[PDB]
Structure formats: C-alpha cells, structure tokens
Symmetry: D2
Subunit: 480 residues, 4 copies
C-alpha cells in the first residue's frame, strides 16, 4: 500500500485539467468521511465541452487506426502502472471490497485491450449489387464513420469498467465524447481522464465532467450530441430516452436476475452453491446482473438450501479495505432502508429469512429468504443489495416461465448438463444473455452485453459499442 | 381497380366500411373506396400481433422463405394490375410504375434469400484466465410486434422494405399505408392472406394520421419503423416511448459534376434529368441541387435546358409521359410558392416554370440563393437548381450545407476526388458516376442528419427487427 | 430411359458413338447406351473451356443466378424422369431416388442464392505509420477451368455440388461422371445446354478411368475436384501437377449411443438402421460401426436386430423396397469376403447375412475384431458392426481408431459429452442426436485424415473455385 | 554475432555441431557457425511435434496470445541484435535490416491480436423440411504438425508469417530456415524457448536442401508451407503426398505509369527506384518491369536514370548504403548473363550495368525484347526494364504476358483504369498509386499462376493451419 488519492481533483475540459472548484465532496462509503473533493462542472462548462467536441469531430475522424490504437495502448500501460492506485480509489469511493476492486481494475485493462485490438480492424464490405439488370455495373463499398460527439453517463457501482465500455470504443471508433460519471464515484473516471490527457489526442476529443443529475440536462437534450449512451437505473434510462430528441439512444439498465438449478446438478452442488453465493453477494449484490432469484429443482432443494444457508452465513461482512471482506457497505443508508423495507414487507406477507437478515445502517448482511410471493417488491423490483430469494420448481418449463415473470430481461443462468434444457432456455428466456453452467452474474468484456424488456436497448462489448458509435457510409460506384 | 377494398386484420379481409375514398391523381375522380380502420380495429390488430409472436418465432426459416416466394410469384403474376393500381392512386407514370413493381419483386426476392441465412457466431471468450472454459453462441430472435408506417410516393416498394424483412425475421407486424395511396399495400396484404401464416402475423390498416396515435405510442409494439417526412418522423420519435425507432426520411439531394466530365456530358445530363424529374421529383433522393464545375458549366447548362424542355408532361397512363401530376394541387402550390420567392430574390427560371393545378412542368433555375426555401427545404417536385463551383472542396462543403444527408452523387473519374467525397460528404450514401437517386434494393439505405436514423435494405432491416441473444456456455 | 444419350462438348450434344453400355443394376440388362469421349474429345473440351474463361468471368451475377434458376425449374418439371433414371442406372430404391432429385434441386437452389452474394472486404491496412494512407479491397475471381470427377452412388447430387458452385463462381468446367451411372449427369447437361451460357462453359464427358488421365494432369485446368474412393483420390493428388486439388473421399463412419439414451432407443434404432442400410449402405457417410454403452447394449441390440430384419430387400422400382442391389456382384463379393473373414476370426452374424449375387441383405454383426477388414476398410454395403463400451472417452478413441475421418454421430443429451466429442473426434463433422449419415446441402461437408482434403457445400466450393484478388489503394 | 548457435529440437537448444558455416555476405568471411540438423534430428523433431499436438490444441487462446506477446517484447529488446545479424548474414543494408525487424514485430503483433478471435459460425441449416430441427456450429481446429521452409532474403519476416500464425492457431511446427541465413530464425527460436510452450511445440533446424527431404515427404506433417523459388516450390508439391501444400513463390513484377501522372513523376520515380533496387532487387515483389505511357516516357526516363545513378552501393553496414551485395557471385553471374544476352539482342543499358563480384550496380535497360530471359524469368537482382505503351489495355496485357502473377502496381488517378486493372491483371494483389513491392503484414498476400498457391497474412495463414470442424445438433 502507498496512498495516492489526492486531496482535490480537477475536471477535464477538452483534454485539459481545470481546478474550477472543490464543490463535489466524495465520501468514503464505509467510514462516511470526506475522502476527496473534486471540481463540479456547471452548465457553462458542459456547454463548452460540447462545443469543443464538435470542433474535434474532423480531427478525430482523420486520426489513423494505428494512432487510435496507440492511445488505447498508452491507457493500458498506465492503468497497469497505477493498478493499486485505481483499486484503492475504487475501494474508497464505492465502498467496494478491495479484492473485487482489484478485479474491476483488471477488467478495466481487459476492456481497453479489447478496444486496442478492435481499433485496427473496423473493416467494411465490398457488396455485390448486380442483383438485376437495372443494377448491372454497380458495386457497393462500405465504411464505418464516427457518429460524432457522444454523450456518456455511467453509474456508481462499476465506475471504472462501465466508463471503459463507452470511452474505449469511442476512441477506437474516432468519436469525441463527454463523460459524466456518477457523482458518488467520480475519481476513477478522473484518473482515466488524467491518463488520456497525457496522449496526443486532438483538443476536444474528450471531457470528463462531474455533475449532479439535476444539473445534467444537456447530456440528454443538447442536439450537438449524436448519441446518448446511458448506463444506470431503468427509471432514469427510460425517462432520458423520452427527452433525448433526435440523437440515437443506447440504454444499459438493471433487472432482477434469476439462476435455475436443474435436476441433474447433485454431483456439483458445492460448485453451484459457491457460484450462487458469488452472484448474489458479490459487491453486496450491487451488480446489474447480481443473482436475486434462485429457482431450484425440488429433488435437490433441501440439500442445496442447507449448503447455501451455510455458505451465506460464512461470508465476511465489514471494512472493504480488509482483504477478507466479501460483503462491504451498501452505497448509502437510504438504499439499505429501501431494501430492508421490501424485506420486511415480504416477511410480513409470509416469507422467511433463512440466513442473515441483520441490517445496521448501510451494513446489510448477506441474506437469503424463502416463501417470497411473486407479487412482492422484493421479488419484482431490482433489489441491488445483498438479498436473494430461494424458490422451488418441478417442471423446467415452469422455471423458465418464472424467470420471464418480470419487467426485466438482462441475463439469466441455468446450471444444467442437458442439451435439451439448455436449448429450451436459449429459445424461451427473454433476456439479452443466457449463461449455461454459471450464474447470470458472469460477463467477459468482449462479449455482446445488454438487456431486453425494461433492462436495456442495445448492446455493449467493444465490437457492438463501435457499431452504435459509427454510421455506415456506402459508396456506390457505377461502371458503364 | 376494384370498386372497394377491405382492410386486413390478423391476416383476414374485413369489409368494415367504405369510408376512405382514393382518387385518381390525374383525373381527380374517386377511383376506389377502401375500409378505414378505427382505434378499436387498430387495438385488435395489436393484440393479435402479440398473440402471434410465439407462432411466428417458431416458424422455420424455410417456411418463412416459402411465404416470401409465394409473394414473389403472385407479384409477377399480377404485375400489370399492380402497375396500373400504382399509376392511378399515385399518378405515377406507367413506365415508372412498372419500374416500382419490378423493384417490389426484387425486394421480396432478396428477403427470400436472406430468410435462410440469418446466422449467428461462435465467439472466443477465452481472452483472460478468468474466462477460461467459456464460449459464446449467438442468434437473432424476432424483436416482437412491429409498427410500420409508409408514405405515398413508393406505396409498394417502401412497404416491401418493412414487410419483407419482418417476415424473414419472424416478426408480426401492423402496417399503416398512406391514406392517399393504400391500395398497393392492400394488394400486398391480399397476397399474404393467401399464405398459411399464423393468424395475427400481419394487419394492414388504412388510417389517417390523426387517427394513428397507437402506431407510435402503444407499448406492445417493440419497434416503430417510419418512412415519410422529416417533420413527422422526428416528432414520432419523441412520442414513441420505450420501443426502438427507425426513421427513413427526406432531403435536398445534390449531384456534383466534376471538371473531367466534358466528354460524358450527354450521359450526365440524361441522369440528372432522370434524378430531378422522375415521378415528377417525388422521390426522397430526387436530384434537387446540381453543382457543376465552372470549366464546363455553360455546355452542361445548354444540354440540361434542352433535355429538361424535351420531357413530356401529361396523363401518367400514357407510356410517353415522363412528368405526371404532383400528388395534389396543394403540394404543387407549396413548391410554386418557393419558386416564386426564389425568383423574387434574384433567381432565374431557365427551363419550364409553368404550373397548372397539380401539373408542374419539369423546371430548372439558376442563381438560387443558398438561404432560399427552394434551396434548403425538400422540394419534392419537378424543380432543380443549378449552381457553379471552382474548387472541389467547395462543392463538397455546399453539398453538406443542409439540414439533410440522405444521398449525394458525384460524376468524376478521379480516384482522389471520389475518395475525398467518401471521406467528407455527410450522407448515408455517396454515388459515384450516377445521381444520388440510384438505389438497388439489397444495399444499405438511409440518411444521417435530419434525413434518417438507421438503415433499410433487407439485411439491415432484419438486424433492426431482431434482438441478439447470447448463450454463454461454461466448461469446467 | 432414351435408347441413346449424347455427350456434351462445349455446351452441345454430340452423338459420337454408343460405346458405353449402362445396365439396369437390378435386372442386369442394358438399359441405354451413351457416347463415350476419347482423349481427343477431352482435349477439345479443355481447349473450349479455356476460351470460355473470359466470357464466363464477365457474366453478371444475376445472369449466373438465372442460369441456375433455369436448372431448378427444369429439374422440377423433369423430376420423375430424373428419379427413374437414377433408380435404373444406380439400382437406387425409387423412394431414395426421388429423395436425391430433391437434393439436386436444393443444391442448385443454394447456389442460385449464393451467386448474388459473393462479396468482398474493405480492409483496414493502417496498422502502422508505414502503411498510413493504404486501404485494401477484395474480390473473388473465378479460378479458371475446373476438372470435376464424380462417383456412382449419388450421381446427381454429388455432380451438383461441383457444377452449381462452378456456375455461381463463373468457372468453365469439364465433368466426368461415373461410367456406371452417367445418364443423370447427361440430363443435367441437356438442361444446361438450353441456357445461353457462352460456348465452352461446360462439357460433360463419359470416360472410363483408364481413358481419363487428362482430367488430372492437363495443366490448363486450375482446379481438380474429385469425389470418389480414397485409393483413387490420393493417387490423383500425386499426379495433378500445379493445380489446386479438392478431395471428397470415404470412411467407416461410427455412431456412439451414450448411457442416457434408454428412453429414446426406438428413435436411435430407427436412425441407426437408416444410416447403416439406406441405399444398401452405399453412402460415404453410411453407418458402419455402432458403439453402445454397456448399460443399454442388450436392449438396443434386440431392437436393432428386429429393425434390421424388418427391412425389405428387392426390386428398387418397388416403392416398398429399402435394400436394393449393390452396384455389382463384384462389390458384393468384396464385402461378403470381408464378412466371412470376420466370422472366421470370431465375429457373429446377429441379423441378415444372406448374399445372392448383388442382393446383400441388411446385416448386423457383433464381436468383430478391430483388426478386421470389415472393421477398418470402407464396407460400402449393407453391413454394420455393433460393439460395446463403458467409458465415453474409450468410445471416442475407438471412433478415431481408423484411417478415416469424414463424419461421426453421437446420441447424447449431455452437454459435457457433446462438447468432448466436438473437441476430440478427428472428423470433418460431428452429428449430435443423429447418425453420421446426415447432410444438408448448404453445410460445410468433407473429411480429414484419409477421408478428404477441403470442403464442399456451396459457399465452401465457391471459395475453392475462386482466387482472392486484393486491390491496395494508396492515398497520399 | 555469437561464435556459435545451437539448433532447437523440441523447444530446447542443442549444440549438436558447428558444421553450418554462415558467411558475412559482404566480406565473404565466416561470421558464425551453427548446428546443422541431420535426418535423425529432423525425425526426432517430427515425432516430438506429433506428441505436442494435443497439448498445443488445449492451450487457451489467451495463453497463445501471451506467448506471442512475449516474442514481441523480446524482439523489441533485442532489436539491434536482430538487425545486425540480418545485415551480416543476408548482406542486407542495415537501414532495411532494421525495417525488416520492425516487420517481424508487426507480424507477431497481428498474430497476437488474431489469436483471441478465431471465431466460428452458428449456421442456419433449416433450408428444407428434411432439415427441420438441425443447427450447425463451427470451429477451427489446429491442422496438426506443420512443416515450414523459408528463404534467404526476408528470413525474419517470412519465418514470422508461418511461425506466428502457427502459434495463434495452436499447431506444433518444424521450421527449416535458409542455410545461408539461419541465425535470425535461431534467435526467434531462443526467444520461444523462454516460453512455457509444451515440449515439441517447435523445432528450428538448419538443414541443406539436399538433407531436407523429410520436410516435404513425411506423412506426420499435415501441412507444408513453403516460401522460396518457383522451381523448388512446384517440385515439392509433386512430392508432398497427402498433406496440404501452401506455396509462396516469385515473379517478374511490373509497374504501370499512366498518362495522368506528370505532376507526380518525382514521387513515382522514387517509388520505382525503391521497388526495383531495395535489397538490390532481392525481393519476391521487386519491380522488374516498368511500363510508362508514351506521353511522359521521356521525362520519366530522364528522372529515373538520374535517380538510379544516385543510389549508393557498397558496404551494407554503412547506413547510407542502399544497394548492397547480391547473395552470391554465382547469382550475380546468372543475372549478368541474362543482361548480356538482352543487350546482344538489341537492348540498351541506360543506367548502371557494371558488376564486380557480387556488387551489381542498380541497372536500368530499354529495348528489352519480351522473349528475353531478362524479361521473362525472375531477375532477383538490381535490374529493371523500361518499356513504353500508348493504350492502357496494352499495358495490362503486357503485365500479364508472363508465367507469373504475384503483384502488379499501377500509378493512375483514373477510377476507370484502376477498376480495369483490378478486373484484368492476373495477380494476387494489384497496388494502386504505389509499386507492386508494397506489403503490410495483415493483408492477404500471395501469387497466382506460377507465383504461388494460397495466401499468407495472419488471418489467411490461420485458415490454412486449421481444419473446420462442424457440429450438427438435431432437436426433435
Ligand atoms: N427515406 C426513404 O426511404 C424515403 C422517404 N420519403 C419521404 O416521405 C415524404 C413524402 O411522403 P409523405 O407520404 O408525403 O409523408 P408524410 O410524412 O406526410 O406521411 C407519411 C406517412 O406517415 C403517416 N403519418 C403522418 N403523420 C402521422 C402521425 N402523426 N402519426 C402517424 N402516422 C402519421 C401518413 O399518414 P396519412 O398520410 O395516411 O395521414 C403516411 O402514412 C418525403 O419527406 C420523402 O423524402 C419518401 C420516399 C423514400
Ligand atoms: N465425400 C463424399 O462426398 C462422397 C464420397 N464417396 C466415395 O465414393 C466412393 C464410391 O464411389 P465410386 O464411384 O465407386 O468411386 P471410384 O473411386 O471407384 O470412382 C469415382 C470416380 O473416379 C473415376 N476414376 C477412377 N479412377 C480414376 C483415374 N485414375 N483417373 C480418373 N478418374 C478416375 C471413376 O471413373 P469410372 O468409374 O467411370 O471408371 C468415377 O468417375 C466411396 O469411397 C465413397 O465413400 C461417395 C459419396 C460421397
Ligand atoms: Mg490509502
């Protein structure tokens, strides 16, 4: 350990640091103390950033692929150099257990490395257009042109890697961008910005501007932005789509992800239980694909329940700086009170707490319930905390229907060795991604990732983000 | 035309009323009457589309293909009927109407081919030790019920660019054609009704814009795909709610004639006259602005004035007619007013200029200021403007001097200039050695800036009408 | 059958002689006589193919498609003629002959679709400062004249897998069908002669192997694509010279029945009988070896013995015949000799076993030693061997215990076992939940080890029948 | 250079002997001595490769990438050592030796990128009712042990174009470098020996052609990939047996200068001189023939004569040297004999023309008859021929007037002419606005006609070093 968190941070306006004020206090989410103060961007700074992004469109578009790759490679190298600094910043400002903070910094590097690879292979097509006599002598050629200035909004819980899934493809694609990180967790994004400020990018290629939601209207409504890409809560995301105007909108939202445990899993129950506990309680359940609902075949239910109760009770809660901590604080006392209120309501309606259940401020222990009615808020809304619900099924198709019994559809997991059941799940689960033999909580950063129903609109993963951040431009050549 | 047409509700002909009168756009007389859908019928169609989602999703690729092949065969069989219906209800010259029916067949044939090759990917996910043992598999799943809205000017082929990919992708859909030209869509519906598609796979429902709110707002639709005016399309995007939105809109397309074109001027002029005046300029990629290098401007002008004056205006049923009626006297009046204002501000009519009701002759102007409505707004009529340039980059800048960006054309033999145009023209498509008005129905097609959001062409519409669904398999 | 057939030399029928007698493979009587091409005719065909290279290359994609579509339509109209000819000259049961004609049509249909989507790539080449300003563009150019050799058992469809992609790719070709079954190829040629292909686009020339050296050695062919026995194919590769060589050969295909299959044994047994005995085992992916988990062996054995005994042997013109004659008495003698040797070494015939001329009953043995010719060589007749395993990995190793590697089948519901089989089976294709005998005509298809070199299936044949041609453009 | 180098047998350095002397190609003195592999060592290497097939196949993609990344990092650290070794053993001017080390790194970097994206396809197989319920999944499986042979002139980068894709694809390989230039390959081997690759993943074995039969004939190799002279490559294809063969050979590359190039002549002349005389013309895409439009022939000739005469010849250790020694006096004598014959038949030397041992001046000739050896065979030395044309199609015909077809270059700004050249030049690659001598290491690269069979460039080499393995899954 060597402490590198600064007492103050600037924001980044058109690639350069501005120590405009110290008005945004960032707390340590475990101690509650102010850990650092960062510059808060007002609407004039946001407007200036957008104008600079417009001016950077042509210089960014003209940057050759290998230069964009070199920028991304510089980031990769510097993130590796500053690995412990990034991990500690994440631990402090998100209250994220240090082991898992280190894991997210590894993902940040992974995401930029995928972007570095994809930056030099944004290919096009030579299209046969001679499909009829009228088109004799015509040929098509395609390319992907950067869409223009992009507006990026990211959430508190994976602040490094979810910013990376917008920033890194934008650089690969050649788009200027303005990123607004979560005000509770801005420091990681500002370290990313400091690293980018070391590169030769054209001025206006990027701004990173902390701003509260109530001062952030221009990120959605300014017509100079050609894309809004938002990662955050469904309630916010769908509201911003309505206000976005002409720009393209990409939404990465939330859900109440389910895992199914099939009848053939007896011999690997310890593996299953370990992955269920990871998915339900990693980062205290503050994951957009955290396991919230667990559907277990009746033949295995009692044995799995005993094992999962024991595993859940074994998880260490406490200071996220402690490398033995698995369950750190929830992001605020108000979020803990929201979830504990839903838990109380489920219990009042007949549910039973079978592991955990103690809440002390933002310290919510890993908690497991059964007999939760499907009508309950704890069942149907996004828990976003260290609570999971255990339920029983007989017929695989009933398990699938109950996974789908939701407003949401981000990912689902199925522990099965049956080809028939895996195929049926792929056919029938209305989700962005179906995970076989692991929890829905799995993501690798090159894969297409996103939700359907109320959980999203579009996909991230570097290739898919590049597609959204570019416009195809066809050239038709006529030969006579 | 038949005396009356039904609408199609969940694959079924319903003779609900005869309330929508469709006029012959040349004679002005009522040519047919068709059933007008009310909100109850639209709601029932949407509910039926929801119930058809699973049966459509389960329809095998080769059966979706067979449905598309049946349409192709019947459109060939009914070619003259379709072309004459187009001629009547759109006032479209019969030669151009036949051209559109040929394209209707082309569009469905591309869809037939694409229906059986909606492939996915086996993705390497082992990019780090954490992901050892994981593999990805992808497929495209139908997005769900689709809402389709189409315009008056290509009533068969632009409906086809939504209907045919929806069938290939496995989506139920509800199509609202233009009230001025609904018969083509209703003949497409009649042919689809012959097939064994599951009930609720399709509805085709005439409705006026003021009775069509549910096509935009109903949350059971997962996609709205709109083809029509920019003013309407951007307004509907604001009201669509959660659904995906695809927009195919309009523009003021330009053609550049480079300094190396002197020996090809007769070809260039023929294509300019085609692009500016085909279907009386009622094309979303009609040539509206012509930028010509100063070195050959005067020769091109003489030839283009002569060509424009040679174009025959009159009854669209006459095969010799090139310029038929505009869609209404009010649209002709709108364009004539813009022309008058440009002349009042200093422009000069150098060919044509006579307007009589909806009969607007092929017209060419010079000295149109770039601030004029005739320059900047979508003319959608048989008027083109001619202007001069010296430097190629100035021509490119002036093409881009617009709210719009659908397609642009560049007549050049210079690799350097073609490459520069591809780099710099902010449009969906750049056409080299033909006008921007060229489209072949498999190509990616659409606009940027105020001209659109997304692409049509069968492959690209299938992408919008499906959701990727990843399956990650972990081996331990 | 007509009394005589011509051969086709540079698109035209030539009734050169009646020197090749084609027998009815069930009655033994001469059914027709066809013209036999000598080396002078083969040489002339090659020269004509060279002269047709440029006109074939300049044929637009939609014209190549139209040629293929004409074949599809005419094969449909001549369906019964084609099936009856195949039934007579191959002794193929009429139901399976009709099934092959359907495949012939489907193979040409896939080629028709692919003919208009032979796309290329726009490649980013700016991977370093040295390559700043360079871009790559690719296309596929026809490779040139192609030499095609096809076998007796699927004479229509295996010719189609060379002819149809050649037409889609723009290659002139010269096809030598099997002398035992040349008529189907000559009907295909007659249909092609109705199209307006440039003269020299195709020749179809019956010739015996000992008069066929030019098909391998002539340097004017740029590709030899051979479907036939491994002994011949590997020997032709050695003699081919500079040309590209594609080989589609044979094997001793295996099916594994996993421990989880008890509830679907009737399905498994039905597919095993189909794969082992369809066309009397005269299939390059016929089931020859059946490995069954010990826990299910006795139940499957009883069901498979009963199923095998139920198969009707006899006249292939009878639609109830499943087991028709083998292609000749000499081939029946070959297989009967291997069967006798296996029994002498301890094997047991548990169903069938009677041989009378070319009429070889559907036959099942157990206790066949892995050293036996019946185990290790290509049976190509209505014999299958049944063996037992305990460990899934042992089953996989025993599938691989072979010179060959075309396809293998695994009946399993285990993801773990399906994945392991995909990892470990050294074959071109692994079929899960069906026999190795399955093929659909768009899929990549071929062998590794001694079973082949390269892949057919339309897309993959087009790749072999074309050369990529890169255009690098430098901007500075 | 070190005093001695070992060879690498199954990943390990073996100082077996010092029997292969490597000379400094400028001084002629022995610069180092390396271990020469005999048949026993080659056979041991092949057996070890066979044993490494399964461990190499099971290496996860990210581990193969890490191996490649280790190579990139160490090549950067050892950049000067690699460049000096190449300068000495090939006589390659130090500036250009440094350039080839940069290419070595670039080639491994492309391979590192491609190693983690060897994706497959999820194929729709439901193209007919018979195939209802079937789906296809593909993967690329390493082909097995690969035999690699590389030439003297780009010994680092051409070894890299085999070694790096083999590692990305998961194939064990045995590489035989050119005996005249083995040190660079042995440094690559030393770096690979630092990685944790399974034993038998690689061997690098110097051996003379007369002791190298097993590299072509041993049946345990599944692929021979040969880069070298056409006379050798086509001969090895005849002897290869069943294995797949890939050939990267030579040619007599041409550059066309079109009529529109007057304002660019200094750029054109600089690139022509570079392409003709880089590494003293010892390049498989060196410019040998220069076709110039009559309208600017005299001006180009004057400029190219002056540029050619300005090139500095001498010690390749001097950074100012561009024309170093040819690889041997025997090769110099070969080319000077062809030059003498051309002059005796009427050609004129207009620049250079003098030869002193292996020091052959940059030399330009006119009036070389198309029949001459200097015109038609591969010069592989610092000689270029200048000729005149009036019609672009005639220039294209004359480029094609050759046994060869690797790459051609065309300096033109005409879209029409660039398209015609892409249509008509029978070469692997057409370069627009640069010489045929351009290559970037990700692009598809290779020859047609006598110049090659197949393509290198990382993606394309991976395709040849893998077999597709289809998994068909049936759902009922
Ligand atoms: N990008 C493309 O592919 C093309 C685009 N176009 C564009 O189409 C326009 C010309 O067509 P036009 O028919 O006049 O266009 P409109 O925008 O006037 O109408 C198009 C369609 O939208 C419907 N519509 C209009 N307002 C609403 C509303 N509030 N809610 C629901 N539906 C509504 C119309 O209904 P109704 O008329 O029945 O009331 C009609 O079906 C031009 O701008 C042209 O560029 C044309 C061809 C090609
Ligand atoms: N991979 C695949 O797609 C398939 C492969 N096969 C394989 O085909 C074989 C059965 O067919 P079959 O006809 O008996 O095979 P053969 O190898 O006996 O004959 C195949 C073709 O090759 C010709 N031929 C044989 N020797 C030569 C030669 N020296 N030069 C030129 N041509 C020659 C034959 O001519 P002719 O007979 O006229 O003398 C015939 O046209 C089996 O091994 C089977 O596995 C079958 C079907 C599918
Ligand atoms: Mg600290």
């Amino acid at each position: 350990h060597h402490h590198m968190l600064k007492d103050t941070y600037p924001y980044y306006l058109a690639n350069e640091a501005v120590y405009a004020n110290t008005d945004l206090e960032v707390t340590d989410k475990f101690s509650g103390k102010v850990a650092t103060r960062v510059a808060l961007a007002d609407a004039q700074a946001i407007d200036a950033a957008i104008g600079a992004a417009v001016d950077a469109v042509k210089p960014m578009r003209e940057l050759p692929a290998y230069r964009r790759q070199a920028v991304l490679d510089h980031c990769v190298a510097r993130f590796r150099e500053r690995f412990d600094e990034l991990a500690e910043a994440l631990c402090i400002e998100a209250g994220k257990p240090i082991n898992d903070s280190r894991g997210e910094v590894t993902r940040l590097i992974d995401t930029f490395r995928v972007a570095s690879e994809e930056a030099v292979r944004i290919d096009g097509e030579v299209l046969n257009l001679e499909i009829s006599a009228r088109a004799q002598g015509y040929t098509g050629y395609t390319r992907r042109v950067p869409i223009g200035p992009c507006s990026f909004i990211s959430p508190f819980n994976f602040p490094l890697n979810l910013a990376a899934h917008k920033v890194a493809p934008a650089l690969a694609a050649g788009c200027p961008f303005v990123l607004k990180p979560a005000s509770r967790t801005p420091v990681g994004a500002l370290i990313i910005a400091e690293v980018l400020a070391e590169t030769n990018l054209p001025k206006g290629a990027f701004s990173v501007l902390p701003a509260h939601r109530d001062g952030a209207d221009l990120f959605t409504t300014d017509e100079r932005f050609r894309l809004l890409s938002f990662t955050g809560s469904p309630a916010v995301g769908w509201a911003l789509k309505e206000k976005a105007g002409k720009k393209k909108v990409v939404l990465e939202l939330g859900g109440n992800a389910a895992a199914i445990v099939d009848a053939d899993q007896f011999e690997q129950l310890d593996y299953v239980v370990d992955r269920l506990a990871f998915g339900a309680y990693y980062q205290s359940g503050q994951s957009c694909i955290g396991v919230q609902r667990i559907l277990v075949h009746a033949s295995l239910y009692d044995t799995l329940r005993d094992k999962l109760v024991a595993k859940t009770r074994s998880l260490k809660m406490g200071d996220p700086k402690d490398p033995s901590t698995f369950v750190g604080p929830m992001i605020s006392e108000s979020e803990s009170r929201r979830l504990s209120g839903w838990m109380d309501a489920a219990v009042a309606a007949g549910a039973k707490i079978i592991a955990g259940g103690k809440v002390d401020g933002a310290m919510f222990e890993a908690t497991l319930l059964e007999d939760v009615g499907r009508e309950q808020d704890l069942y149907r809304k996004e828990a976003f905390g260290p609570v999971a619900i255990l339920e029983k099924f007989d017929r695989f198709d009933d398990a699938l229907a109950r996974v789908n019994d939701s407003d949401f559809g981000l990912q689902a997991g199925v522990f099965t060795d049956s080809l028939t059941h895996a195929q049926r799940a792929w056919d029938e689960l209305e989700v962005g991604g179906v995970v076989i033999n692991d929890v829905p909580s799995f993501r690798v950063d090159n894969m297409p990732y996103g939700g359907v129903k109320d959980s999203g609109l579009g996909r991230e993963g570097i290739r898919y983000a590049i597609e959204d951040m570019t416009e195809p431009r066809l050239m038709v050549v006529r030969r006579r």
